[PDB]
Design an enzyme around this catalytic site. Sequence first.
Site, PDB file in Angstrom:
ATOM      1  N   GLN A  24       4.478  56.226 -25.790  1.00 59.64           N
ATOM      2  CA  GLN A  24       5.689  56.671 -26.462  1.00 59.64           C
ATOM      3  C   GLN A  24       6.840  55.725 -26.202  1.00 59.64           C
ATOM      4  O   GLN A  24       7.009  55.222 -25.091  1.00 59.64           O
ATOM      5  CB  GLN A  24       6.067  58.081 -25.980  1.00 59.64           C
ATOM      6  CG  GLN A  24       7.547  58.482 -26.143  1.00 59.64           C
ATOM      7  CD  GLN A  24       7.930  58.912 -27.558  1.00 59.64           C
ATOM      8  OE1 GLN A  24       7.082  59.029 -28.443  1.00 59.64           O
ATOM      9  NE2 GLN A  24       9.218  59.162 -27.770  1.00 59.64           N
ATOM     10  N   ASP A 147      19.617  42.950 -18.247  1.00 62.15           N
ATOM     11  CA  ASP A 147      18.735  43.991 -17.739  1.00 62.15           C
ATOM     12  C   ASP A 147      17.368  43.431 -17.393  1.00 62.15           C
ATOM     13  O   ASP A 147      16.339  44.012 -17.729  1.00 62.15           O
ATOM     14  CB  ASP A 147      18.606  45.146 -18.740  1.00 62.15           C
ATOM     15  CG  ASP A 147      17.956  46.387 -18.123  1.00 62.15           C
ATOM     16  OD1 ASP A 147      17.971  46.522 -16.880  1.00 62.15           O
ATOM     17  OD2 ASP A 147      17.436  47.236 -18.882  1.00 62.15           O
ATOM     18  N   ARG A 151      10.016  45.713 -14.996  1.00 56.35           N
ATOM     19  CA  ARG A 151       9.676  46.637 -16.060  1.00 56.35           C
ATOM     20  C   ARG A 151      10.030  46.113 -17.459  1.00 56.35           C
ATOM     21  O   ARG A 151       9.499  46.611 -18.465  1.00 56.35           O
ATOM     22  CB  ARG A 151      10.333  48.002 -15.815  1.00 56.35           C
ATOM     23  CG  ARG A 151      11.843  48.034 -15.890  1.00 56.35           C
ATOM     24  CD  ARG A 151      12.334  49.486 -15.971  1.00 56.35           C
ATOM     25  NE  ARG A 151      13.788  49.608 -16.087  1.00 56.35           N
ATOM     26  CZ  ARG A 151      14.520  49.045 -17.049  1.00 56.35           C
ATOM     27  NH1 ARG A 151      13.935  48.306 -17.989  1.00 56.35           N
ATOM     28  NH2 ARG A 151      15.841  49.236 -17.075  1.00 56.35           N
ATOM     29  N   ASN A 152      10.900  45.102 -17.533  1.00 59.08           N
ATOM     30  CA  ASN A 152      11.282  44.550 -18.826  1.00 59.08           C
ATOM     31  C   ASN A 152      10.560  43.261 -19.193  1.00 59.08           C
ATOM     32  O   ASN A 152      10.949  42.557 -20.124  1.00 59.08           O
ATOM     33  CB  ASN A 152      12.793  44.346 -18.889  1.00 59.08           C
ATOM     34  CG  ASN A 152      13.538  45.652 -19.047  1.00 59.08           C
ATOM     35  OD1 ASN A 152      13.106  46.533 -19.794  1.00 59.08           O
ATOM     36  ND2 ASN A 152      14.669  45.786 -18.361  1.00 59.08           N
ATOM     37  N   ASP A 165      10.685  42.464 -25.592  1.00 57.92           N
ATOM     38  CA  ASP A 165      11.672  42.549 -26.652  1.00 57.92           C
ATOM     39  C   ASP A 165      12.880  43.299 -26.090  1.00 57.92           C
ATOM     40  O   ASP A 165      12.747  44.128 -25.189  1.00 57.92           O
ATOM     41  CB  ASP A 165      11.098  43.264 -27.897  1.00 57.92           C
ATOM     42  CG  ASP A 165      10.674  44.700 -27.619  1.00 57.92           C
ATOM     43  OD1 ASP A 165      11.524  45.529 -27.231  1.00 57.92           O
ATOM     44  OD2 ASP A 165       9.481  45.007 -27.796  1.00 57.92           O
TER      45      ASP A 165
HETATM   46  N1  ANP Z   1       4.393  44.194 -27.084  1.00 58.37           N
HETATM   47  C1  ANP Z   1       3.684  45.179 -26.440  1.00 58.37           C
HETATM   48  N2  ANP Z   1       2.366  44.944 -26.010  1.00 58.37           N
HETATM   49  C2  ANP Z   1       1.721  45.973 -25.375  1.00 58.37           C
HETATM   50  N3  ANP Z   1       2.276  47.187 -25.147  1.00 58.37           N
HETATM   51  C3  ANP Z   1       3.554  47.502 -25.538  1.00 58.37           C
HETATM   52  C4  ANP Z   1       4.284  46.504 -26.192  1.00 58.37           C
HETATM   53  N4  ANP Z   1       5.504  46.975 -26.500  1.00 58.37           N
HETATM   54  C5  ANP Z   1       5.535  48.242 -26.055  1.00 58.37           C
HETATM   55  N5  ANP Z   1       4.365  48.577 -25.474  1.00 58.37           N
HETATM   56  C6  ANP Z   1       3.984  49.915 -24.853  1.00 58.37           C
HETATM   57  O1  ANP Z   1       4.474  51.108 -25.472  1.00 58.37           O
HETATM   58  C7  ANP Z   1       5.095  52.080 -24.657  1.00 58.37           C
HETATM   59  C8  ANP Z   1       6.645  52.182 -24.926  1.00 58.37           C
HETATM   60  O2  ANP Z   1       7.208  51.040 -24.307  1.00 58.37           O
HETATM   61  P1  ANP Z   1       8.751  50.825 -24.260  1.00 58.37           P
HETATM   62  O3  ANP Z   1       8.949  49.457 -23.531  1.00 58.37           O
HETATM   63  O4  ANP Z   1       9.491  51.873 -23.539  1.00 58.37           O
HETATM   64  O5  ANP Z   1       9.349  50.657 -25.748  1.00 58.37           O
HETATM   65  P2  ANP Z   1      10.655  51.287 -26.525  1.00 58.37           P
HETATM   66  O6  ANP Z   1      10.156  52.174 -27.543  1.00 58.37           O
HETATM   67  O7  ANP Z   1      11.389  50.086 -27.150  1.00 58.37           O
HETATM   68  N6  ANP Z   1      11.855  51.824 -25.520  1.00 58.37           N
HETATM   69  P3  ANP Z   1      12.784  50.947 -24.401  1.00 58.37           P
HETATM   70  O8  ANP Z   1      12.121  49.610 -24.271  1.00 58.37           O
HETATM   71  O9  ANP Z   1      12.721  51.722 -23.083  1.00 58.37           O
HETATM   72  O10 ANP Z   1      14.192  50.900 -24.979  1.00 58.37           O
HETATM   73  C9  ANP Z   1       4.653  51.604 -23.306  1.00 58.37           C
HETATM   74  O11 ANP Z   1       3.431  52.244 -23.033  1.00 58.37           O
HETATM   75  C10 ANP Z   1       4.407  50.106 -23.468  1.00 58.37           C
HETATM   76  O12 ANP Z   1       3.444  49.497 -22.642  1.00 58.37           O
HETATM   77 MG    MG Z   2      10.718  48.123 -24.002  1.00 59.98          MG
END
Ligand code: ANP
Ligand code: MG
Length: 291
Positions: A24, A147, A151-152, A165
């Site tokens: 998610q 940031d 984790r990023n 990203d």
């Molecule tokens: N480029 C990627 N390759 C593999 N897994 C990804 C990738 N991008 C996101 N995920 C996965 O998807 C889920 C959500 O990741 P998240 O980094 O929180 O994205 P978000 O929706 O942009 N929110 P945030 O980054 O916290 O502002 C996690 O389980 C991640 O591992």
């Molecule tokens: Mg993210």
Amino acid sequence: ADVYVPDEWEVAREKITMSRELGQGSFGMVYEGVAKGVVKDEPETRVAIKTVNEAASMRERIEFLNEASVMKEFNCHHVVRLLGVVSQGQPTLVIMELMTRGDLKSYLRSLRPEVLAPPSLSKMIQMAGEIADGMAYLNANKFVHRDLAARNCMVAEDFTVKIGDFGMTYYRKGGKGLLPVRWMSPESLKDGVFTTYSDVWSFGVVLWEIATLAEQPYQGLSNEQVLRFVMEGGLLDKPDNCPDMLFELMRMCWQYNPKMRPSFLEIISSIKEEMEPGFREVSFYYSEENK
Ligand SMILES: Nc1ncnc2c1ncn2[C@@H]1O[C@H](COP(=O)(O)OP(=O)(O)NP(=O)(O)O)[C@@H](O)[C@H]1O
Ligand SMILES: [Mg+2]
């Protein structure tokens, strides 16, 4: 107010297929799948598919779109890449380069002794070089992350570490949400000042994360107490069996005075020789662009 202008990044949703969920996200479930013709001379490509839940309004779906668009400007081997977007029609998507191993933090917690080898000095110097390379590229392109944390960062199938990203909103500043105290530089905590130098500070903390298989920085202290400690010249402890050289980097990235800290290019410059052979071919550092 908000509006999204379609562009050449658009992809036909018929070329996209999702096999399974990854996790998610802020706007909705992120999946894994395949996209056709999103890479040069590559019929098909495995990708990460970010979506927005149906419950989402227009503004959100648009916001999702404009935020993913910051990545359109960047193209570095050490920064996760955007491959396309599907703005036309319901299941607003965003196709990203696939990083099968997840975020660096989760990957590090994964090696936790609780049966693979921990990371060796060599392994760590690689991740650090890759992270520093993506940051030098970003900083070179007038962007201050704000940031940077394990984790990023993301980890690829071949263990290449890249900067995930990000969002955005002279030097552009990234960062979104409540910035975490444990990664902030003294000047950032004190004056709310963010620079390439404070990005370097945060860099030292992720090196420390790496070295501790992602322990909590200043573990035991409240953020409130960390705020003061760090502003007072306080620093993180040298990890249990941390390589001297590795801790050296940390200590330099943690010079109280920003100007005394090295740049990402200087960081790289000082460890480039301990990098893998391929680095010279894919790095921003060794690129024609770096100058
Ligand atoms: N480029 C990627 N390759 C593999 N897994 C990804 C990738 N991008 C996101 N995920 C996965 O998807 C889920 C959500 O990741 P998240 O980094 O929180 O994205 P978000 O929706 O942009 N929110 P945030 O980054 O916290 O502002 C996690 O389980 C991640 O591992
Ligand atoms: Mg993210």
